[PDB]
Amino acid sequence: LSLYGHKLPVLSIDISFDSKMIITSSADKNIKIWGLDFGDCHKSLFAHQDSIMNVKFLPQSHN
Amino acid sequence: NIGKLIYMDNISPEECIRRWRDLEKFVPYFDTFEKLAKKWKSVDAIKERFLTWYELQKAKISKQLEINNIEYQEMTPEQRQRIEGFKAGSYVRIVFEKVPMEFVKNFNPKFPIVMGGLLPTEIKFGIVKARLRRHRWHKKILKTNDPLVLSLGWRRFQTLPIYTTTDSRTRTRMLKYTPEHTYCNAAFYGPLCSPNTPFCGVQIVANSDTGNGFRIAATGIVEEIDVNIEIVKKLKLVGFPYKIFKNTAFIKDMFSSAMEVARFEGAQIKTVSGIRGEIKRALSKPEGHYRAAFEDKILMSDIVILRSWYPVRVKKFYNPVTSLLLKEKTEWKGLRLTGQIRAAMNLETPSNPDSAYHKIERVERHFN
Amino acid sequence: FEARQRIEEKNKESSDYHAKMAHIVNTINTEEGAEKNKYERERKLR
Amino acid sequence: AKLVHDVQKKQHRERSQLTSRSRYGFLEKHKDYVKRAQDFHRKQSTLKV
Amino acid sequence: PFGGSSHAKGIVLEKLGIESKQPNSAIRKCVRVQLIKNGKKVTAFVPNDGCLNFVDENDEVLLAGFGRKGKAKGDIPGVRFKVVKVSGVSLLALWKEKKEKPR
Amino acid sequence: KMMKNKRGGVIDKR
Amino acid sequence: SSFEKQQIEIRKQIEQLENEAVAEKKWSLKGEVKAKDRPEDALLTEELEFDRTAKPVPVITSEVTESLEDMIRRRIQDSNFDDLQRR
Amino acid sequence: NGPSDVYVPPSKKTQKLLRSENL
Amino acid sequence: RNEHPYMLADRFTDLTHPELIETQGLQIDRKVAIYGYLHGTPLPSAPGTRVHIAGVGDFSVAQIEKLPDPCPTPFRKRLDDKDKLIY
Amino acid sequence: TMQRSSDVNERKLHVPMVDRTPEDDPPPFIVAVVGPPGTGKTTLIRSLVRRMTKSTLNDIQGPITVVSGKHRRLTFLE
Amino acid sequence: KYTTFQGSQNFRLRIVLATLSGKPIKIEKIRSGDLNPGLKDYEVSFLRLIESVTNGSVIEISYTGTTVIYRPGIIVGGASTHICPSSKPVGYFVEPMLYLAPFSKKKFSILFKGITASHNDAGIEAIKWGLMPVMEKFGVRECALHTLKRGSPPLGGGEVHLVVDSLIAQPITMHEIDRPIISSITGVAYSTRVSPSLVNRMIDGAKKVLKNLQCEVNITADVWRGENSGKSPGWGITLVAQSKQKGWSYFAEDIGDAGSIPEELGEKVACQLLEEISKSAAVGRNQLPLAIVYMVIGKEDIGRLRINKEQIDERFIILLRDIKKIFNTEVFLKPVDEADNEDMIATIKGIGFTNTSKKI
Ligand SMILES: Nc1nc2c(ncn2[C@@H]2O[C@H](COP(=O)(O)OP(=O)(O)OP(=O)(O)O)[C@@H](O)[C@H]2O)c(=O)[nH]1
Ligand SMILES: [Mg+2]
């Protein structure tokens, strides 16, 4: 896959425990949730008004 | 080899392919992708697959006919039995099982024994929609739900037709007779022939009542076939005013209850003067009485009218003639006409007394 | 309820029928009166 | 009458008042109603003037 | 009109205007016919709605010109021909019941 | 309006 | 024989519908029926077809109030106001 | 990347095709 | 005629069983052979083809054995009085 | 004579339909003798079959198929 | 009374040919020796579609669900809609309507609502570009499958408007005694609810397999944006090979799923198409059923169509056995008189079919 459309250089990734759902943080002040089966986006939620340096799942959950 | 294998139908189809060398799945069977990849890495296997008017119509149909002959010129029990079979002029014996006793008993060789092969359509029953016509030399008019014997294809059969009209192409509503000198539509429960086939129809087929007149009564063609028809007869509901004002009136008896008027609220009525109107609300204490509003002031000598439509059914009645199963083979008697039944059991013809026309003379019209 | 439904379906049927009849009338007008006028034009040369 | 039959342009006869409803004489039809209505309208017109 | 002839034989395709809600309207008494000589499809009248139920389909019609003597009212100018026979039988004779149409 | 001019019907005896 | 069985049943139904043919009509199969030419309130069971003059007054349900309110919301967040303007 | 594949979607042509003197 | 396989019957018999008639007693719907020339479109040779015998009812064929021509035409010229046949 | 040629050449044109009658061994053409009771028929069928087949066919019944041409044969019934 | 079949194979073809022929059938033992025996929901909804299309046909499912009685009726058509289940896409229900489609009173204007595609069924592009041209040269002239929106599995939510509006009398007699020269090779790569680069990856894979043949390759590209995309992510590819001098076509399609590389799917559908070209002669292995069905319900003449050796299979001859079981007709396979290949020419004499439902 190639996941695209973040619009600034893109920092930390995380893959979920089921290996189905990835996160994507960047300096665009928002993290994107991607479904890894087809590479389709789910949310593009705007957090964090400077820059999200890191993003990490929980062990067993999708939190 | 392969055709005998295909139509030898006590062996499995994979056994046909095996001794020669499932359709819910639409896309066909392919190999594995890896086998197909190593098979079609090359490309050169299929590189050679890659790279006057009247006499014209007659030439096309004679071209088809010579194609028919030069592709019939094949195996003898294939042509002469099973791929076309018994063209014309072949003298055949043909055996029918369960033929009635009365045919063999009363077989008189004067009357011809004709047989004809029914198509897939002509074994189906249901409503046939024709357009027909009283035959110009038949004297009496025809009546709906009176039987007449139709000659529709190979079959002759007595049926109960009902003559309709599509009054300026809005309904298909029900006449009570055929017209005098033109076509109407008709609908009869019988064997469904194809459309555009013509037919005759006869009131009386026997010879004891053959009279002096012309015996063929109806002519027509078949317009359409169906399993159901939706035809209507008009019913009007008449009611009279009993309390009139300007532009509104109280109407007495076309309904028996305020539930009925509630069912019919907002409907457009009219008087016999063509004054249009609408029913508005059921009055409370007199039961079927309601309040209507009109174009202007109606009179006490008027009748209001609610034109509604009641559906009518064709009568699923069908008896074929079977004239050759009789001892006389003329003198076939089916259902009688309605005048014949009235003459038999001496009932007088129904006469509504206020349906008869009179000689109306206008009084002079003076106003104040 | 039956009032509103029957009125609006009758209006739809009438507005469809008028469009259909006007369409066939002026298609018979245009693409056959062109040929009528073409025959008149090549009959006026005689 | 260019393509019309004389058995087609016949004379439809008009109907009388019902004999049960006969005390209100003469069921009036559309010619009688227009003779009524235009009389009423010309008299209302001169009253309005 | 037809070329060099006065009449032309034709094949009835389908009764145009069969859904017209007005009896004896020029749209209603209006038949589409394929001429057999050059194959082209033209449109022809018929004398009335009453004789519209003598043609049904592929009937071997015979058709002449129309000849309008003045600008009519309910006309559709742009139909040139009129049906004058059907299956080799004059349909004015059919309309006044002098002959019966054979099939 | 769906029932109005039908004549068949599946007969589900299940 | 079988033809005798068929002929007996054919003439049975022939007798049936001939006395049906000479019988009187139903109330619904005549034009011009009053209230007393037909049974009592027989038009509740019957489902007749008639034309009606005007459309009824619209019932105001939650769907039409919701559609009207979001129309108002579009106009009121774009300030599409059809007010009078002071000369 | 294929943003031109959305820039050459059914806009006009595929939108219409994917249904079949001085002085 | 030219979309229908028809046939006029010049020969008729019942190939029933007379001791079966002695068993059941003349009420039997009995089988019948019908010989003749056929016209029109080719009548198919499989059993079960539906057929209207015009005046006795509707049946389906059971077996067809086509026969050699009893009245054949022989292969400027004139017609020999030897070959003017009659069936 | 050109207008005559056009108006005569026009009435050769007819609706082009299929034939479905074979050319090798066509069936005997069905000739039906139709009359009111008391004229011709029997006497006529007898006379025609006697002229055609040189055979006095007294007491007819049923269809009667004779050969009357080199390729046209025909069936007589009443 | 009833022609009896066994087993739940060829179920749609049996009900379709019974509707064409007008013969009452029974289908007995619908998976009776099974854990959940009987008819499944998608074929029950196909029976409901048959009741929608026809009129006066009585279908009679049993108690156990393992035998069905179809007494057919007049094809009337009309405008309808069909909310087909998630077990089968809209192609499973629009494929058997293309047989009944030109032989009705009123023209077919149906819109099916459900999943668009499946691995083991017909797609929109399959139905359109493959199966409409063989009808288009068997006699119909106005037929169109429109997509209003399309829905990839599992949630779907796509609607497909099948409209045929040429009501012919009978299909013409086919005469294809040649192998049609392939003039071009085109296609369509579609994707819904995913990124627009997957379509170009599919196109590049298919065309890098196709690049060594000396014809012209053209694959059109559609991403579906908005409400027209449906409720699920999906993508797929359908290639056709186009003989333009006669109009013939040979197609192959598939769809990707969770974990599928688009260049892999593009080259797979390209190689599957080239194998269909290899195993094809004037039809496809999947266009062959309705081709010989229209040849068998043509006029009462001989119609001949060329086929090759590898198109004969258990599916093809169980089709032929069902055809002869219903309306008693045989195909005659005569071989060609030239021997660089093994091609038969199937001549079928069509039954005397007309459509008797269309009003005159
Ligand atoms: N004078 C005269 N008598 C004729 C003529 N043709 C037939 N007949 C007589 O007609 C009589 C009646 O017998 P047929 O002529 O065989 O009767 P048909 O015409 O077969 O009619 P059916 O009696 O109904 O069978 C015969 O006895 C003949 O004498 C004719 O041209 N002139
Ligand atoms: Mg005699």
Tab-separated table of C-alpha atoms in Angstrom, chain K residues 17-359:
chain	number	residue	atom	x	y	z
K	17	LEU	CA	-36.010	-22.037	-19.820
K	18	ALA	CA	-39.256	-23.093	-18.182
K	19	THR	CA	-40.451	-19.495	-18.465
K	20	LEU	CA	-39.406	-19.353	-22.126
K	21	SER	CA	-40.926	-22.707	-23.052
K	22	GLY	CA	-44.080	-22.477	-20.965
K	23	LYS	CA	-43.677	-25.940	-19.476
K	24	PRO	CA	-44.400	-26.826	-15.831
K	25	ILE	CA	-41.345	-28.210	-14.069
K	26	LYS	CA	-40.452	-29.652	-10.702
K	27	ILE	CA	-36.980	-29.422	-9.223
K	28	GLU	CA	-36.577	-32.170	-6.630
K	29	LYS	CA	-33.891	-32.737	-3.954
K	30	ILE	CA	-32.610	-29.208	-3.462
K	31	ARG	CA	-29.562	-30.244	-1.384
K	32	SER	CA	-31.638	-32.641	0.703
K	33	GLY	CA	-28.691	-34.536	2.140
K	34	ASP	CA	-27.236	-31.481	3.852
K	35	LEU	CA	-27.105	-29.936	7.301
K	36	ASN	CA	-29.307	-26.966	6.341
K	37	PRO	CA	-31.198	-28.597	3.470
K	38	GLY	CA	-33.374	-26.835	0.966
K	39	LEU	CA	-33.480	-23.653	-1.049
K	40	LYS	CA	-31.198	-20.803	-0.100
K	41	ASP	CA	-32.255	-17.188	0.281
K	42	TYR	CA	-30.698	-15.896	-2.928
K	43	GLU	CA	-32.517	-18.424	-5.079
K	44	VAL	CA	-35.741	-17.802	-3.141
K	45	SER	CA	-35.370	-14.106	-3.954
K	46	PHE	CA	-34.699	-15.121	-7.554
K	47	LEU	CA	-38.088	-16.851	-7.460
K	48	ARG	CA	-39.563	-13.589	-6.169
K	49	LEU	CA	-37.923	-11.806	-9.104
K	50	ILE	CA	-39.538	-14.306	-11.477
K	51	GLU	CA	-42.909	-13.569	-9.881
K	52	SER	CA	-42.216	-9.866	-10.337
K	53	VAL	CA	-41.352	-10.258	-14.020
K	54	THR	CA	-44.058	-12.726	-15.053
K	55	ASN	CA	-47.781	-12.768	-14.272
K	56	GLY	CA	-49.988	-15.753	-13.600
K	57	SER	CA	-47.071	-18.067	-12.844
K	58	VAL	CA	-47.539	-20.130	-9.686
K	59	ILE	CA	-44.430	-21.193	-7.762
K	60	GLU	CA	-44.960	-23.716	-4.983
K	61	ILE	CA	-42.169	-24.335	-2.485
K	62	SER	CA	-42.562	-27.404	-0.287
K	63	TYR	CA	-42.482	-27.759	3.499
K	64	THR	CA	-38.891	-28.947	3.696
K	65	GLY	CA	-37.756	-26.488	1.033
K	66	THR	CA	-35.991	-29.169	-1.006
K	67	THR	CA	-38.367	-29.234	-3.979
K	68	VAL	CA	-39.970	-26.468	-6.010
K	69	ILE	CA	-42.825	-26.501	-8.516
K	70	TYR	CA	-42.743	-23.876	-11.253
K	71	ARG	CA	-45.840	-23.577	-13.418
K	72	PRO	CA	-44.882	-20.667	-15.667
K	73	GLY	CA	-46.883	-17.750	-16.974
K	74	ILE	CA	-46.863	-14.799	-19.347
K	75	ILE	CA	-43.812	-12.525	-19.273
K	76	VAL	CA	-45.187	-9.028	-18.664
K	77	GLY	CA	-42.194	-7.026	-17.425
K	78	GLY	CA	-43.160	-3.585	-16.198
K	79	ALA	CA	-41.090	-1.318	-14.012
K	80	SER	CA	-39.929	-2.835	-10.743
K	81	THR	CA	-37.176	-2.858	-8.182
K	82	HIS	CA	-35.401	-5.799	-6.585
K	83	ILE	CA	-33.671	-5.629	-3.170
K	84	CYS	CA	-31.585	-8.835	-3.718
K	85	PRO	CA	-29.775	-10.310	-0.622
K	86	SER	CA	-26.099	-10.009	0.382
K	87	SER	CA	-25.431	-13.633	-0.552
K	88	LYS	CA	-25.260	-12.786	-4.260
K	89	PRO	CA	-24.590	-9.566	-6.158
K	90	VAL	CA	-26.863	-7.841	-8.653
K	91	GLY	CA	-25.192	-9.741	-11.491
K	92	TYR	CA	-26.632	-13.026	-10.227
K	93	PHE	CA	-30.113	-11.583	-10.776
K	94	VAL	CA	-29.563	-9.473	-13.893
K	95	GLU	CA	-27.868	-12.352	-15.746
K	96	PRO	CA	-31.024	-14.545	-15.885
K	97	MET	CA	-33.161	-11.518	-16.723
K	98	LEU	CA	-31.284	-10.965	-19.981
K	99	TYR	CA	-32.920	-14.095	-21.381
K	100	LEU	CA	-36.467	-13.080	-20.443
K	101	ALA	CA	-35.830	-9.419	-21.160
K	102	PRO	CA	-36.830	-8.945	-24.839
K	103	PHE	CA	-39.932	-11.172	-24.743
K	104	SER	CA	-42.434	-9.305	-22.563
K	105	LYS	CA	-45.489	-7.070	-22.851
K	106	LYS	CA	-43.878	-4.021	-21.293
K	107	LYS	CA	-40.190	-3.200	-21.507
K	108	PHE	CA	-37.788	-4.121	-18.731
K	109	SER	CA	-37.003	-1.165	-16.504
K	110	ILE	CA	-35.816	-2.770	-13.268
K	111	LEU	CA	-33.295	-1.443	-10.792
K	112	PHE	CA	-31.516	-3.978	-8.610
K	113	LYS	CA	-30.180	-2.890	-5.243
K	114	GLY	CA	-27.351	-4.655	-3.472
K	115	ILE	CA	-23.742	-5.697	-3.794
K	116	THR	CA	-22.281	-4.959	-7.209
K	117	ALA	CA	-19.509	-7.516	-7.584
K	118	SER	CA	-18.408	-10.967	-6.504
K	119	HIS	CA	-15.597	-13.368	-7.301
K	120	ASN	CA	-17.945	-16.022	-8.641
K	121	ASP	CA	-20.602	-13.980	-10.440
K	122	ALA	CA	-21.164	-11.366	-13.117
K	123	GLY	CA	-20.279	-7.716	-12.646
K	124	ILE	CA	-21.736	-4.553	-14.118
K	125	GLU	CA	-18.966	-4.317	-16.694
K	126	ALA	CA	-19.226	-8.059	-17.336
K	127	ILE	CA	-22.984	-7.864	-18.005
K	128	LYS	CA	-22.658	-4.702	-20.107
K	129	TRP	CA	-19.567	-5.138	-22.254
K	130	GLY	CA	-19.663	-8.906	-22.555
K	131	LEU	CA	-23.265	-10.005	-22.490
K	132	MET	CA	-24.998	-7.037	-24.078
K	133	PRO	CA	-23.183	-7.235	-27.494
K	134	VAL	CA	-24.152	-10.860	-28.081
K	135	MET	CA	-27.782	-9.864	-27.537
K	136	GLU	CA	-27.117	-6.736	-29.611
K	137	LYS	CA	-26.270	-8.891	-32.601
K	138	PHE	CA	-28.752	-11.638	-31.768
K	139	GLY	CA	-31.445	-9.098	-32.423
K	140	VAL	CA	-32.022	-6.590	-29.650
K	141	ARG	CA	-30.864	-3.050	-30.290
K	142	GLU	CA	-31.740	-1.002	-27.191
K	143	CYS	CA	-30.403	-2.513	-23.981
K	144	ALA	CA	-28.523	-0.743	-21.233
K	145	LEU	CA	-27.185	-1.518	-17.793
K	146	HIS	CA	-26.777	1.765	-15.946
K	147	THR	CA	-24.932	2.134	-12.682
K	148	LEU	CA	-26.473	4.745	-10.491
K	149	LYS	CA	-24.232	3.815	-7.586
K	150	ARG	CA	-22.177	0.704	-6.991
K	151	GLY	CA	-21.397	-1.163	-3.814
K	152	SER	CA	-18.459	-3.432	-3.222
K	153	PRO	CA	-18.915	-6.312	-0.755
K	154	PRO	CA	-19.707	-6.921	2.142
K	155	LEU	CA	-22.085	-4.026	2.794
K	156	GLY	CA	-22.754	-3.066	-0.817
K	157	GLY	CA	-25.470	-0.492	-1.270
K	158	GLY	CA	-25.295	-0.069	-5.028
K	159	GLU	CA	-28.115	0.229	-7.524
K	160	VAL	CA	-28.141	-0.945	-11.118
K	161	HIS	CA	-30.808	0.059	-13.631
K	162	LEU	CA	-31.353	-2.673	-16.224
K	163	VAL	CA	-33.402	-1.219	-19.079
K	164	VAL	CA	-34.155	-3.170	-22.225
K	165	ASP	CA	-36.580	-1.510	-24.587
K	166	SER	CA	-36.479	-3.457	-27.848
K	167	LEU	CA	-39.248	-6.055	-27.615
K	168	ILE	CA	-38.342	-8.306	-30.535
K	169	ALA	CA	-40.428	-11.207	-31.787
K	170	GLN	CA	-37.662	-13.828	-31.779
K	171	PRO	CA	-33.870	-13.607	-31.967
K	172	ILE	CA	-32.365	-13.873	-35.421
K	173	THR	CA	-30.594	-16.987	-36.632
K	174	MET	CA	-26.868	-16.758	-35.988
K	175	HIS	CA	-24.340	-17.531	-38.714
K	176	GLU	CA	-20.806	-17.332	-37.344
K	177	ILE	CA	-18.735	-19.752	-39.388
K	178	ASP	CA	-15.524	-17.798	-38.732
K	179	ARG	CA	-13.167	-16.911	-35.927
K	180	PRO	CA	-13.548	-13.134	-35.505
K	181	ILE	CA	-10.375	-11.095	-35.831
K	182	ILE	CA	-9.674	-9.210	-32.613
K	183	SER	CA	-9.306	-5.558	-33.553
K	184	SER	CA	-8.656	-3.945	-30.170
K	185	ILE	CA	-8.449	-4.809	-26.503
K	186	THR	CA	-9.982	-2.405	-23.997
K	187	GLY	CA	-11.206	-2.534	-20.450
K	188	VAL	CA	-12.325	-0.788	-17.300
K	189	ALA	CA	-10.569	-0.619	-13.928
K	190	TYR	CA	-12.866	0.515	-11.145
K	191	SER	CA	-12.341	1.358	-7.512
K	192	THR	CA	-14.693	2.499	-4.766
K	193	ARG	CA	-13.855	3.910	-1.316
K	194	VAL	CA	-10.072	3.501	-1.742
K	195	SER	CA	-7.204	5.563	-3.098
K	196	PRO	CA	-7.130	6.491	-6.808
K	197	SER	CA	-3.628	5.055	-7.316
K	198	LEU	CA	-4.824	1.430	-7.138
K	199	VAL	CA	-6.605	1.828	-10.473
K	200	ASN	CA	-3.416	2.928	-12.210
K	201	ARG	CA	-1.505	0.085	-10.549
K	202	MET	CA	-4.085	-2.389	-11.897
K	203	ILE	CA	-3.946	-0.797	-15.353
K	204	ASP	CA	-0.137	-0.878	-15.421
K	205	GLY	CA	-0.024	-4.543	-14.403
K	206	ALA	CA	-2.588	-5.575	-17.011
K	207	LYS	CA	-0.879	-3.607	-19.755
K	208	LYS	CA	2.616	-4.830	-18.904
K	209	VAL	CA	1.345	-8.356	-19.407
K	210	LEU	CA	-0.505	-7.261	-22.560
K	211	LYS	CA	2.383	-5.249	-24.033
K	212	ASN	CA	3.983	-8.048	-26.069
K	213	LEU	CA	1.007	-8.686	-28.366
K	214	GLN	CA	1.014	-6.401	-31.378
K	215	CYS	CA	-2.551	-5.085	-31.000
K	216	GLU	CA	-3.757	-1.918	-29.227
K	217	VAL	CA	-4.449	-1.934	-25.478
K	218	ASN	CA	-6.692	0.673	-23.855
K	219	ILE	CA	-8.007	0.436	-20.297
K	220	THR	CA	-10.353	3.118	-19.024
K	221	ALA	CA	-10.192	4.175	-15.403
K	222	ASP	CA	-12.947	5.067	-12.960
K	223	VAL	CA	-12.681	5.840	-9.300
K	224	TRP	CA	-16.073	6.327	-7.685
K	225	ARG	CA	-16.304	9.395	-5.458
K	226	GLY	CA	-19.071	10.315	-3.062
K	227	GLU	CA	-22.387	8.605	-2.468
K	228	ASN	CA	-21.880	6.740	-5.743
K	229	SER	CA	-19.066	4.737	-4.113
K	230	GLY	CA	-21.189	2.599	-1.833
K	231	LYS	CA	-20.680	1.378	1.685
K	232	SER	CA	-17.479	-0.663	1.413
K	233	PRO	CA	-13.954	-0.484	0.002
K	234	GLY	CA	-13.396	-2.402	-3.187
K	235	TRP	CA	-11.623	-2.423	-6.510
K	236	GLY	CA	-11.580	-4.606	-9.573
K	237	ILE	CA	-10.677	-4.896	-13.210
K	238	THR	CA	-12.503	-6.100	-16.331
K	239	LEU	CA	-10.852	-6.470	-19.732
K	240	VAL	CA	-12.566	-7.124	-23.047
K	241	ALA	CA	-11.119	-8.037	-26.424
K	242	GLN	CA	-13.081	-6.410	-29.219
K	243	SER	CA	-13.714	-7.644	-32.745
K	244	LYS	CA	-14.999	-4.455	-34.347
K	245	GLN	CA	-15.881	-5.647	-37.856
K	246	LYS	CA	-18.665	-7.858	-36.482
K	247	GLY	CA	-18.967	-6.654	-32.895
K	248	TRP	CA	-17.812	-9.706	-30.980
K	249	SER	CA	-16.141	-9.528	-27.598
K	250	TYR	CA	-14.351	-11.758	-25.108
K	251	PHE	CA	-14.155	-10.637	-21.501
K	252	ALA	CA	-12.513	-11.466	-18.198
K	253	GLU	CA	-12.888	-9.789	-14.815
K	254	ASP	CA	-12.070	-10.082	-11.154
K	255	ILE	CA	-12.068	-8.062	-7.933
K	256	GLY	CA	-9.544	-7.606	-5.176
K	257	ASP	CA	-10.133	-8.220	-1.495
K	258	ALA	CA	-8.429	-7.734	1.871
K	259	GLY	CA	-4.725	-8.191	1.207
K	260	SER	CA	-4.552	-8.054	-2.566
K	261	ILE	CA	-1.865	-6.393	-4.666
K	262	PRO	CA	-3.357	-4.408	-7.575
K	263	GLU	CA	-0.535	-5.182	-10.003
K	264	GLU	CA	-1.077	-8.853	-9.130
K	265	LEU	CA	-4.804	-8.589	-9.840
K	266	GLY	CA	-4.216	-6.665	-13.069
K	267	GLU	CA	-1.763	-9.204	-14.450
K	268	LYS	CA	-4.018	-12.054	-13.270
K	269	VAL	CA	-7.034	-10.698	-15.136
K	270	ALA	CA	-4.813	-10.030	-18.168
K	271	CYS	CA	-3.543	-13.615	-18.267
K	272	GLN	CA	-7.054	-14.955	-17.618
K	273	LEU	CA	-8.266	-12.922	-20.579
K	274	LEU	CA	-5.529	-14.244	-22.862
K	275	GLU	CA	-6.470	-17.763	-21.819
K	276	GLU	CA	-10.101	-16.985	-22.669
K	277	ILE	CA	-8.894	-15.853	-26.103
K	278	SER	CA	-7.039	-19.166	-26.394
K	279	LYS	CA	-9.999	-21.295	-25.302
K	280	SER	CA	-12.488	-19.146	-27.234
K	281	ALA	CA	-13.894	-19.219	-30.757
K	282	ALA	CA	-16.570	-16.608	-31.687
K	283	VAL	CA	-17.995	-16.679	-28.135
K	284	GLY	CA	-16.653	-16.768	-24.633
K	285	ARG	CA	-16.808	-19.623	-22.164
K	286	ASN	CA	-19.356	-17.511	-20.270
K	287	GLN	CA	-21.056	-15.813	-23.228
K	288	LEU	CA	-21.732	-19.266	-24.721
K	289	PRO	CA	-24.892	-20.146	-22.604
K	290	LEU	CA	-27.180	-17.318	-23.703
K	291	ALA	CA	-25.683	-17.441	-27.196
K	292	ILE	CA	-26.883	-20.985	-27.731
K	293	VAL	CA	-30.098	-20.248	-25.815
K	294	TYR	CA	-30.946	-17.482	-28.283
K	295	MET	CA	-29.963	-19.816	-31.116
K	296	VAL	CA	-32.365	-22.415	-29.770
K	297	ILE	CA	-35.240	-19.954	-29.318
K	298	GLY	CA	-34.686	-18.304	-32.704
K	299	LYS	CA	-36.868	-18.966	-35.760
K	300	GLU	CA	-37.615	-22.441	-37.119
K	301	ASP	CA	-34.415	-22.401	-39.175
K	302	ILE	CA	-30.844	-23.624	-38.852
K	303	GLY	CA	-28.444	-21.309	-37.044
K	304	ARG	CA	-24.776	-22.182	-36.868
K	305	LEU	CA	-22.071	-20.886	-34.558
K	306	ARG	CA	-18.413	-21.850	-34.369
K	307	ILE	CA	-16.970	-23.138	-31.085
K	308	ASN	CA	-13.648	-24.711	-30.246
K	309	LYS	CA	-12.614	-27.948	-28.581
K	310	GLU	CA	-11.884	-26.561	-25.135
K	311	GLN	CA	-15.260	-24.850	-24.756
K	312	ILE	CA	-16.854	-28.283	-24.419
K	313	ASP	CA	-17.119	-29.172	-20.734
K	314	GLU	CA	-19.463	-30.653	-18.156
K	315	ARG	CA	-21.175	-27.262	-17.772
K	316	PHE	CA	-21.742	-26.952	-21.524
K	317	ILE	CA	-23.156	-30.408	-21.971
K	318	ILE	CA	-25.309	-30.230	-18.841
K	319	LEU	CA	-26.693	-27.070	-20.458
K	320	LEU	CA	-27.392	-29.055	-23.623
K	321	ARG	CA	-29.019	-31.867	-21.646
K	322	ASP	CA	-31.294	-29.394	-19.852
K	323	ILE	CA	-32.221	-27.781	-23.186
K	324	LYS	CA	-33.188	-31.157	-24.641
K	325	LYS	CA	-34.935	-32.085	-21.387
K	326	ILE	CA	-37.206	-29.062	-21.589
K	327	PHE	CA	-37.986	-28.553	-25.248
K	328	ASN	CA	-36.658	-31.614	-26.974
K	329	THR	CA	-34.055	-30.171	-29.310
K	330	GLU	CA	-30.570	-31.315	-30.202
K	331	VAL	CA	-27.452	-29.535	-31.319
K	332	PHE	CA	-25.479	-30.916	-34.253
K	333	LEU	CA	-21.714	-30.479	-33.932
K	334	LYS	CA	-20.222	-30.640	-37.332
K	335	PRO	CA	-16.435	-30.258	-37.579
K	336	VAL	CA	-14.806	-27.746	-39.872
K	337	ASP	CA	-13.033	-28.982	-42.998
K	338	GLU	CA	-9.584	-27.608	-42.112
K	339	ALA	CA	-7.193	-29.113	-39.617
K	340	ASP	CA	-4.845	-26.698	-37.911
K	341	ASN	CA	-7.274	-26.589	-34.957
K	342	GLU	CA	-10.216	-28.463	-33.455
K	343	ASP	CA	-13.340	-26.333	-33.915
K	344	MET	CA	-16.862	-27.588	-34.222
K	345	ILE	CA	-19.675	-25.589	-35.741
K	346	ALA	CA	-22.769	-26.126	-33.654
K	347	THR	CA	-25.895	-25.977	-35.783
K	348	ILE	CA	-29.128	-25.664	-33.828
K	349	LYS	CA	-32.508	-25.682	-35.480
K	350	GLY	CA	-34.444	-23.241	-33.374
K	351	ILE	CA	-37.911	-23.979	-32.106
K	352	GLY	CA	-40.727	-21.920	-33.558
K	353	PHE	CA	-40.574	-19.155	-30.978
K	354	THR	CA	-42.444	-15.893	-31.058
K	355	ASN	CA	-43.172	-13.604	-28.157
K	356	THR	CA	-46.936	-13.676	-27.820
K	357	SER	CA	-47.137	-11.213	-24.959
K	358	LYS	CA	-46.444	-8.035	-26.924
K	359	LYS	CA	-49.745	-6.453	-27.943
